Amino acid sequence: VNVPKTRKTYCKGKTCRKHTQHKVTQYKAGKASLFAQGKRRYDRKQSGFGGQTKPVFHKKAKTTKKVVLRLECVKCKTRAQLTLKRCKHFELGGEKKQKGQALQF
Amino acid sequence: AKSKNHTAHNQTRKAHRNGIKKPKTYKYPSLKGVDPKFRRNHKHALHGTAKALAAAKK
Amino acid sequence: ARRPARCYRYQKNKPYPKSRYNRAVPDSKIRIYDLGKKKATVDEFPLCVHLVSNELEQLSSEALEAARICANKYMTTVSGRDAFHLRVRVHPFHVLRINKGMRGAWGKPHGLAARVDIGQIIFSVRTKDSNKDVVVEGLRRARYKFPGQQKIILSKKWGFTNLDRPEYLKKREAGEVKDDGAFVKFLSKKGSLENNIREFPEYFA
Amino acid sequence: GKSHGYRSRTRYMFQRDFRKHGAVHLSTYLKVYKVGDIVDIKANGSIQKGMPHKFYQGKTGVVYNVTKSSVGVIINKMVGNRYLEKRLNLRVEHIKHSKCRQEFLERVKANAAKRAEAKAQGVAVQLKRQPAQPRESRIVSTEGNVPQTLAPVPYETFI
RNA sequence: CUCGUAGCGGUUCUGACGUGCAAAUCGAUCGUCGAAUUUGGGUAUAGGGGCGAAAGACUAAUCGAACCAUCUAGUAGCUGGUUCCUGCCGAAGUUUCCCUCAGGAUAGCAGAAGCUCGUAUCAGUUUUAUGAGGUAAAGCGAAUGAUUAGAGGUUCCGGGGUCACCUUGACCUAUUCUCAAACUUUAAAUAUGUAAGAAGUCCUUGUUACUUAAUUGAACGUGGACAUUUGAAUGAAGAGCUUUUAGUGGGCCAUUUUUGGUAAGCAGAACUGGCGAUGCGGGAUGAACCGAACGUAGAGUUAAGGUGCCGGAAUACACGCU
RNA sequence: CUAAUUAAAACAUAGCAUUGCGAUGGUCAGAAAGUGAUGUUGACGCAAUGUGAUUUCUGCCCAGUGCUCUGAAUGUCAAAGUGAAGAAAUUCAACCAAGCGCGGGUAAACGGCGGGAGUAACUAUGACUCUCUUAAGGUAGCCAAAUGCCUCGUCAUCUAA
RNA sequence: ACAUUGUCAGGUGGGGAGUUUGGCUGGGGCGGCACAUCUGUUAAACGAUAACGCAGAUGUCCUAAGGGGGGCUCAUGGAGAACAGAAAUCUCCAGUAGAACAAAAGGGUAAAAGCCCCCUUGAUUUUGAUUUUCAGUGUGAAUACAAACCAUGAAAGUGUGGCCUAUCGAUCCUUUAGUCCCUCGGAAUUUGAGGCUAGAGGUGCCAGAAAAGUUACCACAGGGAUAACUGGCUUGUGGCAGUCAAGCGUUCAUAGCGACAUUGCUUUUUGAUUCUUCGAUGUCGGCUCUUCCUAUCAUACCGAAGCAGAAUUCGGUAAGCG
RNA sequence: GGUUGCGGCCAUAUCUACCAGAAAGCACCGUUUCCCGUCCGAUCAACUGUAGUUAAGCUGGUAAGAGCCUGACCGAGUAGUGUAGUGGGUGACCAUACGCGAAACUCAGGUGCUGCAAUCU
Ligand SMILES: [Mg+2]
Ligand SMILES: [Mg+2]
Ligand SMILES: [Mg+2]
Ligand SMILES: [Mg+2]
Ligand SMILES: [Mg+2]
Ligand SMILES: [Mg+2]
Ligand SMILES: [Mg+2]
Ligand SMILES: [Mg+2]
Ligand SMILES: [Mg+2]
Ligand SMILES: [Mg+2]
Ligand SMILES: [Mg+2]
Ligand SMILES: [Mg+2]
Ligand SMILES: [Mg+2]
Ligand SMILES: [Mg+2]
Ligand SMILES: [Mg+2]
Ligand SMILES: [Mg+2]
Ligand SMILES: [Mg+2]
Ligand SMILES: [Mg+2]
Ligand SMILES: [Mg+2]
Ligand SMILES: [Mg+2]
Ligand SMILES: [Mg+2]
Ligand SMILES: [Mg+2]
Ligand SMILES: [Mg+2]
Ligand SMILES: [Mg+2]
Ligand SMILES: [Mg+2]
Ligand SMILES: [Mg+2]
Ligand SMILES: [Mg+2]
Ligand SMILES: [Mg+2]
Ligand SMILES: [Mg+2]
Ligand SMILES: [Mg+2]
Ligand SMILES: [Mg+2]
Ligand SMILES: [Mg+2]
Ligand SMILES: [Mg+2]
Ligand SMILES: [Mg+2]
Ligand SMILES: [Mg+2]
Ligand SMILES: [Mg+2]
Ligand SMILES: [Mg+2]
Ligand SMILES: [Mg+2]
Ligand SMILES: [Mg+2]
Ligand SMILES: [Mg+2]
Ligand SMILES: [Mg+2]
Ligand SMILES: [Mg+2]
Ligand SMILES: [Mg+2]
Ligand SMILES: [Mg+2]
Ligand SMILES: [Mg+2]
Ligand SMILES: [Mg+2]
Ligand SMILES: [Mg+2]
Ligand SMILES: [Mg+2]
Ligand SMILES: [Mg+2]
Ligand SMILES: [Mg+2]
Ligand SMILES: [Mg+2]
Ligand SMILES: [Mg+2]
Ligand SMILES: [Mg+2]
Ligand SMILES: [Mg+2]
Ligand SMILES: [Mg+2]
Ligand SMILES: [Mg+2]
Ligand SMILES: [Mg+2]
Ligand SMILES: [Mg+2]
Ligand SMILES: [Zn+2]
């Protein structure tokens, strides 16, 4: 899946409130950040005996994750989050479809 | 065990023991589902009708 | 080795022919449907004698071939192979299944059958009027190869046509009758007059 | 497994009515729908947007909402032991007027008209419709028409 | 080491007995009989422990985990049972979700309590008008796809036979026989949607920020016109509404149309009627068939079925057949 | 030895072999102990196993997994300790023991022990040979055996069968 | 001043402990997914409708294969061009779609929905309404609006992803975007944490537990809701019959036979129901002993022969007796 | 009545062959500086109705035309189907009773109608 890395979408930036240009990056999660409350509760609950308390999930079934485009307005730096479908490949760069050219390999 | 999966035998006897009702229409339906532009004007087209009715009677 | 003809005798399931979902149909064993002097003209054989089913059933492809052999063998040994035109007017298109404890029961194709209505013609023999009792006994022996009950109806048509013997005659001194390979073409009051002249020119005299 | 999609079992129903494929003729787009008009739902397969679900093909209902290209139609749907009000957003090329309601509304104009000369004279003009009443007396003549038929025919096979 | 007593074991009769003499005996026949023998007393090892020349054997008739008491009335979607009478009403074995499929929840079916009112609004029905359907049938010299047989049309489309020929293949044109659950121009019956008016129709013209080039349209109105033949038929047993709650959520049969299966008192569907939950008359007998559904009695008449005798009722009448 | 349905081919056995241990020890107890068994002991001992008298032999395999090794030392390496930034809670980085990974030894440790094709002056048989994968490709022996489905294999013997 | 000891941290640790090992199922096991889906059929012309029914497809692909505009006609056939033929390009005629539209199938489409070109990001923001599955919950998909903001085109218009019908996911936790908004409860500042609105990360057993085996030592609650033995139904198969007669039988269908067909019989063979039996109907063979059937091996009496005799073979009555 | 522009229903209008068209409109037709587009003024754009023509388009007629459309007591009250019986039949199926009722075929007839505007010996 090919997505352009520059987009003209609506901005909820309270100054644009219109279609502006957006620079587009793919969204990655970010680190778990200990001292989150559910992580501190995880630390106090695993201590002692009896072992694992919360479930440890195993039967994963998806070959894919939905890709989230993490946009940013070029004018007011107000960011957006768009979501696409499941895809085994996600290409953010260029390499557009040249039509009348000979195949190879 | 092996079980009878599905049948609609006896389902219309129960459907008629309490007598199927048509949905009991009313004068003045709800304006949910109307074109919101039309409903928006209809608030004013009936407000001013009441002003021209209430002032003309008094 | 084969299930008897009483097993699939009655029509209990729908017509199940050979197409893009069956794909594995075992072929029939009646593959000849016209017999005798099939290239005789219409006028040589004026007398159509029929085998007609009085019961709604299935004739099998084995049975239609076996009755064809028996009826052909009698008529040639009495009057010869150019004294009749035996036409089997029945084609076995219906495919029968077979299952081979009750699980995965859906079947694999077994044999070919031919659904015949009450009043449907099985066989038709056209011949001369002198050879009539030969043809009946040739068809009377062919009854034994068939389940159900079959009738020997002397038709009133002229041969293998759809018009009666005197109706075919008044069309014959008149010019609406002319030969083809196996059958006879007829004249109409319709179409272009030039094509009514190209073919059929003995008319308009 | 089993398939229960939106256009399931709609093979012949959404088909396009032999030798009448192609574009929608323009009288469909010139028809005028008002709220309260009673319309017959028949989906045109060549228009895939605004297309009713297969339950509503042939159903008849009342226009309640009017948008740019679509009417809002109310259909009564039997669900279990009662009917529920179904509100459908269908474009006007799946929709025609019910010709019965044109036949009704002229009879309303007729019964208004027939009661007018009931007010000139002769009250109770008997304007209600009646069923096919039994026939009256006849006297059937025989002049040129003497009664003749023969008997039942015998059995012939006529093949 | 050997034969063989006492002893100590326990092979076979698969003996007796098998409510015994006996919760392991009795009898015969057997193994072994001077040692890794047999045995008394003392002593040690204790239950998830001991002990085991090892069989999960033995550890007080208890052993793949002793016995006693407590926690403990442990838990049970499983089986049994659940105690007086009469009256009235009266089911379900189906929906959706659930580590759900012997169970729940949820909707449906049922009862009760009523409440607001008083024949409105309706209806497992018809008629009239108006749609929708692609099934049965029909069709294949109509398309797609099968399939039968001859006709007419001459080509390095490799027909060998000249180096224009009896012994050409297909192809095209007109015919012909036979067909289709996943083919079709057509197209039923049955079933199905809507309408058949006062919340209506008509006239006048009031409002609006919607809409129009334009009070034009749209929607809702004021005022006025029409009264029960007020806009088909038949019925209506009161209509409408609310709350709460039980059981059920194993089904089965028959007619018709069905899928699978050679077939089934088979496995699965659809519509209806039944049984379950139901007696009564008939089918000798039978959950389901036929007739008909039930307070206690009397009289009459019937149903389905019968009327030689059992057995109430004509060894009736009639025409034949065997 | 299965008391009370199995007395046996099962268990034991001598013989054989393997393994661990020189006492601050091996093997095992115990909640701990200034606590125990072996042990009133000391490798001709004690402990842990396997096979099971004698005759005659115990082939090939260390790739797997276990066991073992004064073996390799920036692959991984927890806690403590060290350092940087921050106001600090904290974040990061370096260092990083055992153990794992790496290398090796061990089969009387657990265990394993092959196909297709053509070839001898017979027709196929196949000493030898060509590949596929091995760590090794079942040696010595023995056998329709208490181990072989086919199988009541084939032959001989026993019998009239 | 090292072992030892106390505490903590990494390893080792079935020696010991506890727990887990889904469901549907013509019994369970096995295989498969009918477990969440789509198209056509099943499915019987509204809708709905089962089977481990049938034929296929789903967990993708796409910045264009999305949006708009303009121009053009596609499969294929015929005739024509040097190499060049059966297939290279070129030109005309015929071409209702016989092509193509990402992917199955069905439907739809001819100045287009297809082919070529130009411009673009509407595959956008915000809140409701609606349709299907349906409890009228959720999820997914979709339809019509409305407020914006854009694309596009001359414009009317069209666009809230793919021409339509499938292509997907709760609480808790983590993360990101938004406001720079609420709180940290003695009062503040700064980090830090918590909060609100919208997405992501995932439960495919797809409304979503965190889980390897075996039991012949097994045990308990039940279950004929369930496998075997029997009885009963059904009868593929097994056997036994019959009709027809192409042929065999030196000639000659039928003395005796008999193909291709066809119609039945048996429940003693073998297959299908899980109907009855799980608070147990004692499971094979044999021995012993009785009776019954006749589809007759012998014996009695017969008929036929391709019956000279002798011996056979076909058939009848017949189960009295072996 | 013809014709043109815009249409409605979308073959009674389509397709095949041959023949006619007065006026008018429409068309073919002439040219390429401009606007514009192409490999190429054939398409498209632009220009003058100027050089000419009904040859084509187009309209209409002809055709025992093909097709399409309408009707039929044409098939045919047929096939099918709803409902009923302790009807028939071993069954397959069938007959009757009260209803509903085709299609193919076959004959007959037809071959655009019409709206708004504008013009035409
Ligand atoms: Mg059930
Ligand atoms: Mg479907
Ligand atoms: Mg001794
Ligand atoms: Mg001794
Ligand atoms: Mg002794
Ligand atoms: Mg013993
Ligand atoms: Mg005994
Ligand atoms: Mg006693
Ligand atoms: Mg001795
Ligand atoms: Mg003693
Ligand atoms: Mg223990
Ligand atoms: Mg054991
Ligand atoms: Mg105890
Ligand atoms: Mg208890
Ligand atoms: Mg009652
Ligand atoms: Mg679900
Ligand atoms: Mg349940
Ligand atoms: Mg129970
Ligand atoms: Mg109730
Ligand atoms: Mg159809
Ligand atoms: Mg049919
Ligand atoms: Mg069907
Ligand atoms: Mg129907
Ligand atoms: Mg339930
Ligand atoms: Mg139950
Ligand atoms: Mg079937
Ligand atoms: Mg009862
Ligand atoms: Mg009766
Ligand atoms: Mg009774
Ligand atoms: Mg009886
Ligand atoms: Mg009787
Ligand atoms: Mg009394
Ligand atoms: Mg009497
Ligand atoms: Mg014993
Ligand atoms: Mg000691
Ligand atoms: Mg060895
Ligand atoms: Mg550390
Ligand atoms: Mg060897
Ligand atoms: Mg269908
Ligand atoms: Mg349907
Ligand atoms: Mg396919
Ligand atoms: Mg998928
Ligand atoms: Mg264009
Ligand atoms: Mg596609
Ligand atoms: Mg397709
Ligand atoms: Mg979904
Ligand atoms: Mg939770
Ligand atoms: Mg505080
Ligand atoms: Mg925060
Ligand atoms: Mg689920
Ligand atoms: Mg019991
Ligand atoms: Mg006999
Ligand atoms: Mg005898
Ligand atoms: Mg005899
Ligand atoms: Mg007897
Ligand atoms: Mg006897
Ligand atoms: Mg020019
Ligand atoms: Mg009845
Ligand atoms: Zn911005």
| Most distant pair of Cα atoms in chain C: their distance | 78
Closest C-alpha among D50, D53, D63 to residue D96: D63
Q: Centre a 10 Å sphere on the Cβ of residue C39 and count the other Cβ atoms it contains.
A: 11
Q: Can you tell me the distance from the alpha carbon of C148 to that of C120, in angstroms, rounded to the nearest whole number?
A: 13
Q: Can you tell me the distance from the alpha carbon of A52 to that of A59, in angstroms, rounded to the nearest whole number?
A: 18
Judge whether C54 and C146 are in contact, CB under 8 Å: no
Q: Can you tell me the distance from the alpha carbon of C23 to that of D67, in angstroms, rounded to the nearest whole number?
A: 53
Q: Centre a 10 Å sphere on the Cβ of residue D121 and count the other Cβ atoms it contains.
A: 7
Closest C-alpha among D62, D64, D36, D40 to residue D52: D40
Extract the tokens encoding C65.
């071939």
Q: Can you tell me the distance from the alpha carbon of C203 to that of C192, in angstroms, rounded to the nearest whole number?
A: 15
Q: Can you tell me the distance from the alpha carbon of C26 to that of D48, in angstroms, rounded to the nearest whole number?
A: 44
Cross-strand partners of D53: none
Judge whether A15 and A76 are in contact, CB under 8 Å: yes
Judge whether C158 and C46 are in contact, CB under 8 Å: yes
Q: Can you tell me the distance from the alpha carbon of D30 to that of C126, in angstroms, rounded to the nearest whole number?
A: 66
Q: What is the DSSP string of D20-32?
A: --SSPPTHHHH--
Measure C189 CA to ligand 33 centroid, in angstroms: 82
- Pairing type for strands D38-41 and D60-66 reads antiparallel
Q: Partners for D (CB, 8 Å, 3+ pairs)? A: B, C
Chains C and A touch (3+ CB pairs under 8 A): no
Q: Can you tell me the distance from the alpha carbon of C62 to that of C111, in angstroms, rounded to the nearest whole number?
A: 9
Which residues touch C47 (CB under 8 Å, ≥6 apart)?
A: C126, C127, C128, C129, C131, C132, C135, C154, C159
Q: Which nucleotides of E are covered by protein (CB under 7 A)?
A: 91-95, 101-102, 107-110, 122-124, 127-135, 145-152, 174-186, 192-197, 199-202, 206-211, 218-222, 226, 228-233, 240-241, 250-253, 258-264, 266-274
Measure D85 CA to ligand 40 centroid, in angstroms: 22
Extract the tokens encoding D14.
């959404």
Extract the tokens encoding A20.
């502006």
Which class for A22: exposed (0-12), middle (13-18), buried (19 or more C-beta within 10 A)? buried
Method: cryo-EM
Q: Centre a 10 Å sphere on the Cβ of residue C126 and count the other Cβ atoms it contains.
A: 26
Does B33 contact D64 at a Cβ distance shorter than 8 Å? yes
- Pairing type for strands C57-60 and C150-158 reads unpaired
- Report the alpha-carbon angle C60-C64-C69, nearest 5: 145
Judge whether C149 and C55 are in contact, CB under 8 Å: yes
Q: Helix, strand or coil for residue C78?
A: helix
Tokens 């960011």 — which residue? A79
Chain B closest-CA separation from residue D33 CA (Å): 15
Which residues touch C80 (CB under 8 Å, ≥6 apart)?
A: none
Percent composition of chain D: helix, strand, coil (DSSP 3-state, to 5)? 20, 20, 60
Q: In chain A, at which residue ranges do the beta strands (DSSP E only) sit?
A: 6-10, 19-26, 66-73, 81-86
- Using left for φ > 0, alpha for ψ between -120 and 50, and beta otherwise, residue A33 falls in left
What are the φ/ψ torsions at residue B53 (nearest 5 degrees)?
Answer: -95, -45
One-letter amino acid of D26: L
Tell if C196 CB is < 7 Å from nucleic strand H.
yes
**DSSP element (H, E) containing C116:** strand C108-116
Distance of CA C65 to the CA centre of its chain: 12
Nucleotide nearest to A18 (CA to C1'): G149
Cross-strand partners of C51: C123, C152
Helices (H), D4-120: 27-30, 99-120
One-letter amino acid of A45: K
Tell if D114 CB is < 7 Å from nucleic strand G.
no
* The dihedral sign for the CA sequence C166, C170, C173, C179: negative
Which residues touch D114 (CB under 8 Å, ≥6 apart)?
A: D125, D127
- Stretch 130-159 of chain D: residues touching chain C, C-beta under 8 Å: 157-159
Tell if C189 CB is < 7 Å from nucleic strand H.
yes
Q: Give residues after which chain D gaps, C-N over 2.5 angstroms.
A: none
Tokens 């019965």 — which residue? D100
Which residues touch C126 (CB under 8 Å, ≥6 apart)?
A: C45, C46, C47, C48, C49, C84, C85, C87, C159, C160
Cross-strand partners of D78: D83
Distance of CA C21 to the CA centre of its chain: 29
